[PDB]
Amino acid sequence: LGALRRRKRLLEQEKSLAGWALVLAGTGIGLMVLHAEMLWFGGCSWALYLFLVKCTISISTFLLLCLIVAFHAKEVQLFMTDNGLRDWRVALTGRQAAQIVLELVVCGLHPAPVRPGFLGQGEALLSLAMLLRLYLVPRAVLLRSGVLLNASYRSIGALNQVRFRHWFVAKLYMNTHPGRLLLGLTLGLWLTTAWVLSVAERQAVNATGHLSDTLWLIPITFLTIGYGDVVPGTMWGKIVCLCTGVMGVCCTALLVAVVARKLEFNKAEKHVHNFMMDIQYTKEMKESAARVLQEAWMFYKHTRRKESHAARRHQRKLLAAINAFRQVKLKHRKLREQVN
Amino acid sequence: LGALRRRKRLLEQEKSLAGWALVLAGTGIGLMVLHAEMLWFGGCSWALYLFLVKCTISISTFLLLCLIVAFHAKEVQLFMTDNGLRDWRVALTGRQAAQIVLELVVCGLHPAPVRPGFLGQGEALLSLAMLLRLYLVPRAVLLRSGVLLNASYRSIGALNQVRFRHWFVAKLYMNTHPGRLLLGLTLGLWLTTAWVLSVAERQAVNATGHLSDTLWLIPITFLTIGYGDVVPGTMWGKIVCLCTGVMGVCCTALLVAVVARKLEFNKAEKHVHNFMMDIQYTKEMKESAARVLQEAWMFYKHTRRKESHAARRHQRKLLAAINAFRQVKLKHRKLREQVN
Amino acid sequence: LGALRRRKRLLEQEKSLAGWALVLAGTGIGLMVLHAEMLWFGGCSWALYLFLVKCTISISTFLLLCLIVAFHAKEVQLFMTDNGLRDWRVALTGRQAAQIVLELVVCGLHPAPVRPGFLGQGEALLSLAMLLRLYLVPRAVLLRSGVLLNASYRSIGALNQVRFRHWFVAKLYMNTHPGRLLLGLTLGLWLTTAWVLSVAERQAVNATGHLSDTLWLIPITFLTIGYGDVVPGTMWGKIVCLCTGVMGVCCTALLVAVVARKLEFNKAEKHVHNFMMDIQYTKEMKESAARVLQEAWMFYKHTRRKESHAARRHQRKLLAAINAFRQVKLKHRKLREQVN
Amino acid sequence: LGALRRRKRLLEQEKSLAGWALVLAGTGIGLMVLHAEMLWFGGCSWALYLFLVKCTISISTFLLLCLIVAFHAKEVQLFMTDNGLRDWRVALTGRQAAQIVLELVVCGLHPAPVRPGFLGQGEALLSLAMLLRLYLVPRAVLLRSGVLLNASYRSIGALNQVRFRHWFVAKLYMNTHPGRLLLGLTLGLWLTTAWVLSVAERQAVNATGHLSDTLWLIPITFLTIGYGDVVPGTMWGKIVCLCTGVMGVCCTALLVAVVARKLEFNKAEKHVHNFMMDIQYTKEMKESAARVLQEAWMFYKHTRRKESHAARRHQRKLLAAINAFRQVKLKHRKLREQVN
Amino acid sequence: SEEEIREAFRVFDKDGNGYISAAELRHVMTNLGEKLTDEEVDEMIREADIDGDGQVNYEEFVQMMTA
Amino acid sequence: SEEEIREAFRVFDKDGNGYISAAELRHVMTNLGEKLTDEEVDEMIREADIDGDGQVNYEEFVQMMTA
Amino acid sequence: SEEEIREAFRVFDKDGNGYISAAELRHVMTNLGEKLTDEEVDEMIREADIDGDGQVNYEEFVQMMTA
Amino acid sequence: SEEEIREAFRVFDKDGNGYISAAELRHVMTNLGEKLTDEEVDEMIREADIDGDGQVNYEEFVQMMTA
Ligand SMILES: [K+]
Ligand SMILES: [K+]
Ligand SMILES: [K+]
Ligand SMILES: [K+]
């Protein structure tokens, strides 16, 4: 009975241990953006502030690198408890070690305080390599969703799918309420890409490629409405503009797929529509019967009193009303056929 | 029992009030357009006419700011009747009062006559703030559709708890009359957006941004066929050209979703197609059997005549006819099993 | 009874008159293009040939205006025979007379020979008004298809109001074999639209609007790939470049709808695929069980050898094999549940 | 039985006999590119190397033209052993002979060495005529897919009322894993199309038109994002760039169709989601009653103390809780209705 | 030249067998669409004169009207 | 002015018939949401004084509370 | 080298057992597709000479024809 | 630490009850994947020595192997 609580305790520990790493990774990006934009406008006059802001990034990276190891140790403990092994030597595989070392080498890339307004190639690539730390978002979202927290959830899921794929949670979020998520994705990619393009094509002549132009160029490339008044002029700016249309076509496909589903009736709506159609059909039928009898009498009286030959249109009206009555009778018959 | 009579008369009064509010909500917009164009083309020569056309807007707004209160009083009375408690203090909620205040402050924005052809900023925003009065359209469309006008409809509506959301009416209109509504929306948005952009980018040099250019630039942006011969040159004109591209993709998705449904057969068309396929299959099988027998006998006769070239050609024809007969028999059995 | 043969004879006559009108209405269109190009390239000193080529258009129009009255007379006879009436005073309604006079006034527009390389406005509108004669194509296609030919099929379809419509034939052709029809429409709308634009925008000196530029501008507008190197410069050329994008958005929706159906399995393909993957499932299960047994024996032998490195490796391999065997067993259980 | 092994032996033989042609037909394509780029950059100084690399193409073509005949002979042997014929005169038909001669006349088209950096026309067409050798890929892909390799599958296919086709294997590959195949096609069509247009518009002196400009123009046309900074200027370069949007619209349609299916739930996911929402529904339903009773008692106490100031709000809360309880009860009953 | 007269009369049925009297058919006709007066009641009497008893036996007295 | 009180009480059922005692209703109320003390138990006793026996017969003594 | 001769003969069945006479098979062959004359009827008589009685026993005399 | 051993043994079933002999298990192991010789057959005999009769009673002598 102790394991039934120990597993939940360690999983709850993992929840916070993976939640904190997201904040400690976002802090690094927040500081790198500030330093990059400070070196441009500030110039060479500000050096002590740059040195002080370039070391907090290194401190944050060191603090981040001490949480991935703890998370993997908790994962190893969970695996050992679930499989009942007693020695940790067999719990660790080579593939897991390779994944761990890859994570620790990806997460450890920072400009560093080692060793006038333009960034060097090495620094400009190391800073832009800090955006790879976004792979921690899916695990935090999955662990915070609660689909895996409860013991009953795990028990019921083990029958069909033992490992909860991220695609299941993605589909759940998509079908519960779209629109908000899609808008967030569209308005969070028009700001994290404009800055990258401005870094790629930042000119000191007349600010020919700063945020006053990229914020206009990116949307009209995402929506395939490319005008041609402003275009990229650097090999590193012609690749960010080919990865934006690929992310626009997929978004359009997702929007079309969502819209196709969003306009479908349910059972209650179909029942209400069928009831309204049936009552409308009955009312039209009775009105048509009244019309046909009235017009038949009118034509008969016109013939009886010999009101010249002006009663020709009366036969036309009689035939049209009769055929309309037959048509509505057939429609009501077929409707009663399918609804029964 | 007068409860039904009370509900019906309250609903009819609400319908009349909602219709008259929408009637009075268009005169202000028309007068705004007229005054904005008169101040541009007329110039500073016309001042008394401008004052007269500006005071009528304030008069119309004052007359509009009472129908909303009357409509909400009718709503409160209807709530009391449906939940009889005879205490007006408890029937009103805080969020309802907040939304009443929001409605009254939104509907009360107009360029009042507080105090050469260019609208100084602060008045050109008050004028364009009068287009927010279009939130009354869905109410006047839904409530007059007749779904709420019958107690029998309300019975099943309470049974299924549909609440008669605007989405249901929109879906019903889309299913019943598609095409006309889509053209109406796409032709009523190319005129109310080609005037806002003209106001944003109205130039006094050579009319570089008047309706002679916006009426050409808007339709080639809604369809993502941006040429680039004319482009916006003002921030307020750039933000407008991004809001005509995000609703040029939603319309395309709606069109695709609508078109996908119209290509499917109904119940009777499938039966008609099945019969038309069956008759052709039977006749072609009969013809194939006739060809098989005739070709076999002709091949035997040709072999009796000892030529062997017409005989080998007839062997090829016989094999082709045999395999065609086998294929058509298999297909006929297949769709006969499908029908059965 | 001779009525059965009379109806078939009358319908065959209707088909013949509906087919001959379609080939007498193409001569005028083919001659108007020749006359326009002769007047453009030939210039003056060609008045006699222009007069002969223009009188033939009037003769053809006069001959066409006699194949509509007879067709409508056959329609009236068919209506009378079906309903049953004598001494016609009823069959001819007012709406039918209005439709007939509208047909006869639409079909009678041509550049008559009454009373230097540029066409006048009246002639340039009368010539382009001859394209309205294409409403005859759907009627001829529907009558020729034979859906109304067979008496037994029509009789059995008359049980319900099938109301044989151009939409049914269009859907039949769409589901029968798309691709050919869509390609024909796309490659036939890129010439009759590229000639109208050339007529609208044609420059006397240094031709910059003839077929050497429209044949390039039209295809890059239908596909919304508007470059901007050549653009219309006349209002009559701008209005015709907005009706090309509308016919390009709908074709894409049609293609998507067709492909969505074309990417689906039939009945037997699902069974074939299920059997093919089930065989692989069974063989993989057998191989996995063999691997489990072999690895267990190898681990036992290694433990007997007393060297705890390959022992750990084999224990890990045994655990992986066991979990894979459980996974494939669960997958096969799901297979058996879904197939039965 | 001899035939049961002869069939498989011959099929396995023709497997390699058709797989070797696929690798002998790639050598010519890989050598033509090298020869063209050697003639462009190398100039007239290199002639012996050009002659040596041009003779190898002819040798490879001669070796390729001796495998199609062997493959067709092996297929004719299968035809004989399947239909039981004994004379080779009847096995071959006219249509098959025409197909064979067309294959042998389309495979053998190379710039043979019959006889200062531009490929004179008549050779630049023979070189680009070598891309027609790609019709061999689908045959090898289908024949190596294993659908025909297995005897049991081939025997079952006859009774399955289905014939093996390229469409079947294409659909299987699309269903299994479409993510890799689509990107492979889109990245393999951006090189074989960017080299052809560079050949078409290779410009000297100005050095404008080579791959450095084509690799930027091809991807912004496939995605319909045409900017207009670089456009084709040759009649042979205006046809390659409108054959790219046609096969880009199809790719977009394929992506949309794939995503629409990929966004759907499977069998067990619906049950999991139903249970997850049902337990929450029950929790909310049981939690509502506690608030209902607490608010009722607090309202009673407030009426006892006769202040009524908070009692009015408590009555509002009681009404809200009651209606929420009714709504959640109705929703839970509906859910129990659908699930049962 | 008519059919389904049974259902046509059963739609506006008053006596159970489609034998609605002259006043019955009169108020059925006047209720929907047009309305009339003493002229209409005399017209109903004339129409029922074929039956001569008020109970409109439509099954027999419809062929003459529809001819 | 209420309905489905049977199921409302059966949700928080303790004695199998909706007759949950004063302590039963007390811990039902305190467990979910707010919690209270001697004042709350005295209030619960006063509320159950209508029954006078502990087993709150809701189906009878609910009308006065909901009135 | 043939199969389903039963259904092949039942398609053009005249006597109910696939034993259609010489004239029966003659008008079956002539009506659909090609048409012929005295030469064709003599050829049909020669073909049916295997049975020698007119009633073409296909199930027995089809093997020689298809061999 | 195992389950479904009944089905696991019934996979490679030879005697109908999962009692496949030493040679049976030997050719089962050698045929699929790895193949071996006298050393492997001796090791298999040693492993099956728990049963001591050839017919491997897995349901009894599988717990020690899987422990
Ligand atoms: K463009
Ligand atoms: K452009
Ligand atoms: K586009
Ligand atoms: K575009």
How do the domains of chain F map onto residue ranges? 5-66
Q: Which residue bears the tokens 């299994």?
A: D176
Distance from CA of C102 to the nearest CA of A (A): 22
Considering only CA atoms, which of A255, C243, C223, C254 is closest in space to residue D223?
C223
Distance from CA of A157 to the nearest CA of C (A): 13
Residue positions forming the annotated binding site of E for Ca(2+): 13, 15, 17, 19, 24, 49, 51, 53, 55, 60
Q: Is C319 on the interface with H (CB under 8 A)?
A: no
The neighbours of chain G, by the rule of 3 or more Cβ pairs under 8 Å, are B
Per this entry, what is the length of chain H? 67
* 8 Å CB contact between H60 and H25: no
Amino acid D296 reads: A
B235 to chain A: closest CA residue: A216
Q: How many CB pairs under 8 A join C and H?
A: 37
Which residues, in sequence order, are CB contacts of A8 under 8 Å at separation 6+? A151
**Cα-trace Rg, chain D:** 35
Q: Which helix (H) or strand (E) covers residue A60, if one does? A: helix A48-83
- For residue E53, the 8-state DSSP code is S
- Contact state of A224 with B224 under an 8 Å Cβ cutoff: yes
The annotation status of H49 as a binding-site residue, yes or no, is yes
Q: Which helix (H) or strand (E) covers residue B32, if one does? A: helix B3-41
- Contact state of F8 with D289 under an 8 Å Cβ cutoff: yes
Distance in angstroms (rounded) separating the CA atoms of residues B199 and B195: 6
- A-chain CB neighbours of D255 within 8 Å are 249-250, 253
- C-chain CB neighbours of D228 within 8 Å are 227-229
The neighbours of chain E, by the rule of 3 or more Cβ pairs under 8 Å, are A
Amino acid A106 reads: V
Distance from CA of B48 to the nearest CA of D (A): 50
A229 to chain C: closest CA residue: C228
Q: Give the sign of the dihedral formed by CA C89, CA C91, CA C95, CA C96.
A: negative
> b/e per residue, A45-80, with b = 16+ CB within 10 A?
eeeeeeeebbeebbebbeebeebbeebbebeebbeb
Considering only CA atoms, which of G50, G58, G47, G59 is closest in space to residue G23?
G47
Q: Which two tokens stand for residue A280?
A: 């409308």
Q: Let me know if D244 is exposed, middle or buried by CB neighbors in 10 A (0-12, 13-18, 19+).
A: buried
Q: Give the sign of the dihedral formed by CA D156, CA D162, CA D167, CA D168.
A: negative
Per this entry, what is the length of chain F? 67
> With left for phi above 0 and alpha for psi between -120 and 50, is residue C45 left, alpha or beta?
left
> With left for phi above 0 and alpha for psi between -120 and 50, is residue F4 left, alpha or beta?
left
Q: How many CB pairs under 8 A join B and D?
A: 21
* CATH architecture, domain B185-264: Orthogonal Bundle (1.10)
Q: Which residue bears the tokens 């190009």?
A: C37
Distance from CA of A302 to the nearest CA of E (A): 12
Q: E45 alpha carbon to ligand 4 midpoint, in Å?
A: 76
* CATH architecture, domain D179-264: Orthogonal Bundle (1.10)
- Of A216, A255, A265, nearest to B253 by CB-CB distance is A255
| Mutation to test the C interface, candidates B211, B254, B269, B272, most C Cβ within 10 Å | B272
What is the 3-class SS of D172-219, one letter each residue? HHHHHCHHHHHHHHHHHCCCHHHHHHHHHCCCCCCCCCCHHHHHHHCH
B286 to chain G: closest CA residue: G11
- Of C93, C161, C228, nearest to A330 by CB-CB distance is C161
- B-chain CB neighbours of A223 within 8 Å are 224, 245-246, 248-249
* 8 Å CB contact between A16 and A67: no
Distance in angstroms (rounded) separating the CA atoms of residues D9 and D60: 28
Please report, for chain D, how many H helices and E strands are present, in that order.
16, 0
Q: D224 alpha carbon to ligand 2 midpoint, in Å?
A: 10
* 8 Å CB contact between A197 and A214: yes
Taking an 8 Å Cβ-Cβ cutoff, which residues of chain D contact chain A? Answer: 216, 219-220, 223-229, 252, 255-256, 259-260, 263, 265, 268-269, 271-273, 275-276
The full DSSP string for A144-211 is HHSTTTSHHHHHHHHHH-SS--HHHHHHHHHHH-TTHHHHHHHHHHTTTTHHHHHHHT--TTT-TTSH
Distance in angstroms (rounded) separating the CA atoms of residues B131 and B25: 10
User: CATH class for domain F5-66?
Assistant: mainly alpha
**Cα-trace Rg, chain B:** 35
Distance from CA of A262 to the nearest CA of C (A): 17
Note whether D179-264 and D267-339 share their fold: yes
Query: A326 — phi, psi (to 5°)?
Result: -65, -40
Which residues, in sequence order, are CB contacts of B296 under 8 Å at separation 6+? B318, G65, G66
Distance in angstroms (rounded) separating the CA atoms of residues G43 and G29: 12
Q: Which fold has domain C178-264?
A: Helix Hairpins (1.10.287)
- Contact state of D294 with F43 under an 8 Å Cβ cutoff: no
Resolution for this PDB entry, in angstroms? 3.4
- Contact state of A227 with B226 under an 8 Å Cβ cutoff: yes
Spell out the domain ranges in chain B. Answer: 1-144, 185-264, 267-339
Considering only CA atoms, which of C314, C279, C319, D12 is closest in space to residue H34?
C314
Taking residue D154's Cβ as centre, other Cβ atoms within 10 Å add up to 15
Distance in angstroms (rounded) separating the CA atoms of residues A327 and D12: 65
- Flag whether G touches E (3+ CB pairs, 8 A cutoff): no
- A-chain CB neighbours of E28 within 8 Å are 290, 293
Q: How was this structure determined?
A: cryo-EM
Q: Which two tokens stand for residue C70?
A: 């007879």
Taking residue E57's Cβ as centre, other Cβ atoms within 10 Å add up to 15
Please report, for chain H, how many H helices and E strands are present, in that order.
4, 0
- Contact state of F2 with D285 under an 8 Å Cβ cutoff: no
Q: Which fold has domain C268-339?
A: Helix Hairpins (1.10.287)
- Contact state of D226 with C229 under an 8 Å Cβ cutoff: no
Distance in angstroms (rounded) separating the CA atoms of residues D197 and D244: 11
Q: What is the CATH number of domain A267-339?
A: 1.10.287.70
Distance from CA of C285 to the nearest CA of H (A): 9
Per this entry, what is the length of chain A? 340
Q: Let me know if B79 is exposed, middle or buried by CB neighbors in 10 A (0-12, 13-18, 19+).
A: middle
Ligand closest to Cα of A228 equals 2
The annotation status of H19 as a binding-site residue, yes or no, is yes
The CA-CA-CA angle for residues A264, A265, A271, to 5°, reads: 165
The CA-CA-CA angle for residues D10, D16, D21, to 5°, reads: 125
- Alpha-helix residue ranges (DSSP H) falling in C190-266: 192-200, 211-217, 219-222, 235-238, 243-262
Per this entry, what is the length of chain B? 340
- Contact state of H12 with C290 under an 8 Å Cβ cutoff: yes
Q: Which residue bears the tokens 């924005």?
A: B109
